[PDB]
Paper text:
[name] channel is a nonselective cation channel that participates in diverse physiological processes. It can form homotetrameric channels or heterotetrameric channels with TRPC4 and/or TRPC1. The fourfold symmetric channel has two-layer architecture, composed of the intracellular cytosolic domain (ICD) layer and the transmembrane domain (TMD) layer.
By comparing the cryo-EM maps of hTRPC5 in complex with CMZ with both the apo state and HC-070-bound state, we found a nonprotein density within a pocket surrounded by S1-S4 and TRP re-entrant loop of VSLD in the CMZ-bound state. Moreover, the size and shape of this density match CMZ, suggesting this density represents CMZ. Among them, F414 forms a π-π stacking interaction with the chlorophenyl ring of CMZ. Side chains of Y374, M442, Y446, and P659 show hydrophobic interactions with CMZ. A putative cation density inside VSLD, surrounded by E418 and E421 on S2 and N436, D439 on S3, was observed in both CMZ and HC-070 maps. Its density highly resembles diacylglycerol (DAG) molecule which shows two acryl tails, but without phosphate group or headgroup of typical phospholipids.
Author numbering:
A (entry chain C), C (entry chain A): 17 to 118, 134 to 273, 286 to 386, 392 to 664, 706 to 734, 739 to 762
B (entry chain D): 511 to 663
D (entry chain B): 715 to 734, 739 to 762
E (entry chain B): 154 to 204
The structure:
Amino acid sequence: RIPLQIVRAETELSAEEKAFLNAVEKGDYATVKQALQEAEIYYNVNINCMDPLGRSALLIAIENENLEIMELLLNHSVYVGDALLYAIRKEVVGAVELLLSYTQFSEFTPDITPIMLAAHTNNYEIIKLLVQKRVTIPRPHQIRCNCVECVSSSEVDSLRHSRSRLNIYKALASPSLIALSSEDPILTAFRLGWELKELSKVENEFKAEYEELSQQCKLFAKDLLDQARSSRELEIILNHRDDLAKLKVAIKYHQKEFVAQPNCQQLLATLWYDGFPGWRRKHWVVKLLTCMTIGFLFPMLSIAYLISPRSNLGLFIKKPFIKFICHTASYLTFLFMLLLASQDLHVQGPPPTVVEWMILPWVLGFIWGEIKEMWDGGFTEYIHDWWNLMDFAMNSLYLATISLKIVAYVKYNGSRPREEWEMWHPTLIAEALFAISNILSSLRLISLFTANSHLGPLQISLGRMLLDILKFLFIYCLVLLAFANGLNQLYFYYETRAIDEPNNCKGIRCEKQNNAFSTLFETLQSLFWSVFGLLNLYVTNVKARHEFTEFVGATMFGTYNVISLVVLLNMLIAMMNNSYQLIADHADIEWKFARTKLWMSYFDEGGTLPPPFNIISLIQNQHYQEVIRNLVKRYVAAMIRNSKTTEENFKELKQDISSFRYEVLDLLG
Amino acid sequence: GRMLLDILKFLFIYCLVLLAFANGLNQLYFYYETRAIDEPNNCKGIRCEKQNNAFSTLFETLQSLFWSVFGLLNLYVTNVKARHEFTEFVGATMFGTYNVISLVVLLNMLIAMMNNSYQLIADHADIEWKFARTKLWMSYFDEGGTLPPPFNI
Amino acid sequence: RIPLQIVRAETELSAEEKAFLNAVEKGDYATVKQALQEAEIYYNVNINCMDPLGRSALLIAIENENLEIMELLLNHSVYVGDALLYAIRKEVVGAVELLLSYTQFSEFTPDITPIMLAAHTNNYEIIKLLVQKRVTIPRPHQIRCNCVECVSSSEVDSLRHSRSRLNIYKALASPSLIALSSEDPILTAFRLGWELKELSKVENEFKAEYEELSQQCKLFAKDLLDQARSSRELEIILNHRDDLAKLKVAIKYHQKEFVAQPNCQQLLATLWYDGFPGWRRKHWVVKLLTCMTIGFLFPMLSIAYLISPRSNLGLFIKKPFIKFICHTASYLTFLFMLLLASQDLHVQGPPPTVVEWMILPWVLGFIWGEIKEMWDGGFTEYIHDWWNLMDFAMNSLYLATISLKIVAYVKYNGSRPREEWEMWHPTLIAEALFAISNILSSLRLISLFTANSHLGPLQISLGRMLLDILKFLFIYCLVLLAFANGLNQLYFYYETRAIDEPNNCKGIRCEKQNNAFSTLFETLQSLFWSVFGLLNLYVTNVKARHEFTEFVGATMFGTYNVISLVVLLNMLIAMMNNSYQLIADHADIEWKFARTKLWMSYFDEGGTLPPPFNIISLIQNQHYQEVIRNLVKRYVAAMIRNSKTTEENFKELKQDISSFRYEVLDLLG
Amino acid sequence: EVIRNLVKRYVAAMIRNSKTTEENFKELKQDISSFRYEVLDLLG
Amino acid sequence: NYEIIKLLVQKRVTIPRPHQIRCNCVECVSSSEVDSLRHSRSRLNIYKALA
Ligand SMILES: CC(C)CCC[C@@H](C)[C@H]1CC[C@H]2[C@@H]3CC=C4C[C@@H](OC(=O)CCC(=O)O)CC[C@]4(C)[C@H]3CC[C@]12C
Ligand SMILES: CC(C)CCC[C@@H](C)[C@H]1CC[C@H]2[C@@H]3CC=C4C[C@@H](OC(=O)CCC(=O)O)CC[C@]4(C)[C@H]3CC[C@]12C
Ligand SMILES: Clc1ccc(Cn2c(CN3CCCC3)nc3ccccc32)cc1
Ligand SMILES: Clc1ccc(Cn2c(CN3CCCC3)nc3ccccc32)cc1
Ligand SMILES: [Ca+2]
Ligand SMILES: [Ca+2]
Ligand SMILES: [Zn+2]
Ligand SMILES: [Zn+2]
Ligand SMILES: [Zn+2]
């Protein structure tokens, strides 16, 4: 048998104390009043005694929402320590008002204060009541602060310091506490969410709590925007300066839900189709014909803007959608010329052809536009855009091409057949670089999928899955390098000269593959091509009769095949499935944020002409404050309605019924 | 690592199917075994430029059926020098049934199992990783083994 | 503007009728009583008037659970038609008892009766109250009944007939109505669930409702089994005759949940490990060593059973687990001999070797065991097992092999080299058939995965996904046949003789593939092998300079590749994913049912010896009734507890409070 | 006529389905408090 | 709510007719240009009422 006793004993209550606590629980006002009056005289009952659950009489009265018994206990001067915190957590306005007018165990940490707890409960009534007085919340220090106080607190007690910081940020990120006590609730929500996201990044632990607090701030900003009821209010909000300034700030803080607001998107769409008033209601054929017409007329629009910007055609290109169409048409003509550029080849360093002469101004315009964007935007913004990396690569390659061409033009005059050219001849390197540049230039069209409704979210999904692909590539490369090292170690003894080969061809790119694993570089290439099955099996064979060596090499090759294809590739498929399912929910918001950034990029005056043509306050504050006041009122009302539309409710109902029953029985009897 | 368990579970039935078809193909083809001298380059087996004797012995049949999973086994290996077209057709049918089972059926079922297991274990990945990392960190708290090789000797 | 009016007008209530209905809704007993007494004299208020929702005063009283006002209305003789149905649906015992003691619109169809509605509500109290009287439910006819009444009702009104049949089956399948009024609740649940499943199969519409009713009956049987509290009760239940007879009946009706009951499984496990009392608590190595020892000693156990069944070794094989081990060991030795059978070949029809002579008794034993199982079990049971099909194939092939061998032995004596043998020589056909038989024999080991905990549910999952594979194979074959027809139509003009080929080899199984699409059979084979990439591209090339024909053939081949691989194979993967996710939940129950069938197959005396050694009542009814009574009581109590542990509840609370308030105000004032 | 029958049946069925929140508990408390105040006024 | 809807329809109540989906009258374009948010909200409210 297992004897069961009380290992951690406490102080039991007497019979009279238990009876008094039972009377308090049942809500019998008369018996509780008699017990208090008798305790004043006989001192037989301790009014501050706890229960087996640790609650005192005052805590029992608070938990039952019994205001009469609460006031009766308060009038008899019972212990009140931390009772206000319990009243606030219970979210009972009457208890809070009663207690405001006036080391034991506690359910609240020592750093919790009444205003902080009210903010944690996000109860607008109690938060407003506490802010009516002079209450303050301590300022959290910098995320990476290194002052003496922060390091001293961290070293003395890391748990307490982290808990206090989390409690402070829970208090500040309260939507009700931001609705009050905040000059600009929208900007406060933006920056508070950004700081919470940064804290989530920095704090490896407590990451989920900071992430959810940041998400809560983002949702509060979105709902405040949702409360707008007219286009005038929306324009006032988005144009406020601390045009579309606040929208730009929201984009800066990655407020995807705020930007993808349907009314914000509608306003941005009206700005986007400046020229066409009825683009929303048109047939597919009409839109396609209009887009084709504007694309084919892009040089005329660019020339008209160059000559006279103030005309029906001069300023027609400054419209965002028209500007986008013209830039896309210019890039498409550039790609068409790139395709045509491959339609005498023995000249060493030939002069550029007509197609190359037409291509050159586009390349110069691309370089000039890149450096102009670099100057106008800045450094950090330029480097934050990943597409710019590709642009840089393209430009560099093109520049290299030009350089090499010039070199080949000045260093060579004779016409020698390409068969006997040097391997590192300038023309061959220039042509290879130009081909790579063509590949990258055509691949640059992916970024335009954002402008499309059907292609945008798909591109978002693929870009997000590229992260899982990158994660898997590391372990794949580790396995590939391991097996390459092993196969090269095994096979490098049987390396044969190219002369001994049947066609004087050495390597795996010959008709009969040979020396697949002779060198580490060739072993890497062989193991790569085996993924796609282009490496034949007889490459694991050697001229000598070393059948054990051939079998071991074949076994290494087979194990590599099994791992890379059966195991790693299926695991990659499973990871992609999971990630795509995870990101399918938020694809629309991500796409709309990306498309909003694309649209905003075409609102600026700079960069109007596509290549190659580019180389040739108090009242506003008062209006914003009035609109913000209206939005805050509407948001508070809506959230109260949503909250209004548990076991403690049934406990309160029972308490009310019992109190009424005792009152009636006392009045009658 | 957790999906490796599903891989191990699937490997048993795959090996059963592979052994069955290897037994059948060897039983059918072991009569037409040819010497290495008769081969065009004195090379016998499937690791030659022209594959031959793919199903002559049980070991070679196992290797041929393994390499057929990755497509490195050519079709003409189901051909014999004699004019036994029925035997060649039956051997080719056995090879094709093995291909259908191992690739179309077994591999897709393995993919489905991996999907289910990965979805199941995605929820608790963080706790498992933190437990493993805690064990790794604790392994470096002890005085013993401070010096890495070769300084430990 | 859209004018809004009442298109379907009704009869509005007067002011006094509306006031009376409001008084009834509020529960004011005094005003309702006064209104009734005044209506008796002045006839100014219609006591049977409806409301805008169609409810009368009696229906309002019933819906509020106001028994006092209900009785007051009943004492004044108000219209009571269909009020009992509303009382039953409300599941109020007091209303039902009041109404039992005593063409307008109705919420219940005309075929609904009080007992049927009570069964639909599955309320044990009301069902018992109605069954206390003499109530009956009409018998549904046969599922495929063809009497005059059924066809007449179906032709006159199919909707009404189907609705009435569904209502009757909803009534009968009520767990409370089966707990009462049923001699054998378990057998009734089994057969009722089976019949509901058959109706679901037959009725293309209403399939989901019959499926859920059948599932409900299965769950009721499982819960009744769950209520057993001792092994004596469980043995009495499972051994009842209308051993393990009721368990066999449950297996017959595919009661998977009933069979996979943990207590049923525990009893079956104790029966399964008859010899070993402590097999549950043993190490893996001990179990493996014991299994290997018993497997290696299987011939000794078989011989001991043959000689003297009554000994420590004679009856040691009759134990189910030992019998399974011996049969598995015998089959494994047979497969080992099959493997050894491939270790002079110029003899036409050679005599059987030592390995073949050892194989022959195993084949004879397999055939004898198959026919013995066919005789002992029956025809329908034998053909219902799909594995038997494979067995049949194996046996047939083996028989064919033997026949051909005999033919080749008697028809040929000379030793001619195999190179110049006929294509259809008996020896070649016999060897091909034997190889196919070996493949099938080794593949037969899949059925033993059921006996394993880790391999069982996996086999269940793969078997269930084979259905999706079969479904996909139809459309794949349609596409394959279409493209084969097209490619053959295009290419059959350029068929070349085998002599013209470089090595006198014609077809795709040559070193240089040729005539890939010349004939329909060869086109089918080429398109099949292209799925696995073994068909080379140059097969779409012809000797003539018909570049258009070659391009069109290559385009057909490429379209076939795109469809079969990119489209069809990925769709197959998606289908397999969905089906595996769907069937992962019930894998354990399916596996345990299959394993129970496997275990039961080894409980019988017949078939004890594996090949080749196989060729050398009133008191019981009273006990079952007592146990069933105990189970029914426990099940009723448990289900009532589970149900006890809506807006109408709050409406009833408000009604009670208002009635109390009116009573107090009348008593005081 | 058929549409009238269908509309009646649909209305009844949807009302039944809707019948079969914190504001409900607030209303219950309000009713109890009103009854309590009425009784206390009537007695006292 | 069927009860309240019936009570209000007992009187003479009307709901404004929404225009064509691709209507191009002067009133629609004027309302869209003056306040797109208000016009869209009113159209959505009308269609919520009718449906
Ligand atoms: C598929 C092969 C033939 C490559 C074709 C290359 C280009 C001709 C395609 C690739 C991506 C296409 C672009 C994808 C995105 C859009 C957005 C599209 O706009 C919309 O879809 C919605 C209306 C709007 O832009 O506001 C305008 C066409 C455009 C530039 C497309 C123009 C044609 C592009 C450049
Ligand atoms: C993987 C390759 C080498 C093929 C091996 C073929 C056989 C040697 C394997 C295949 C399936 C195996 C069987 C799968 C199922 C079982 C159940 C197993 O029992 C259990 O797992 C739980 C204990 C119990 O049976 O009650 C006993 C071994 C046995 C017959 C296995 C014996 C060994 C078998 C026949
Ligand atoms: Cl070699 C290259 C270099 C840079 C770039 C980047 N870049 C683009 C590309 N856009 C045009 C359609 C898809 C994205 N337009 C530009 C206009 C001005 C400056 C840079 C520009 C593309 C290609
Ligand atoms: Cl050629 C063959 C024919 C039939 C069969 C069916 N069969 C089996 C197969 N069992 C043994 C282990 C896995 C399933 N045992 C038997 C005992 C008696 C009778 C038939 C029997 C297998 C192979
Ligand atoms: Ca750029
Ligand atoms: Ca059988
Ligand atoms: Zn600090
Ligand atoms: Zn009938
Ligand atoms: Zn209009």
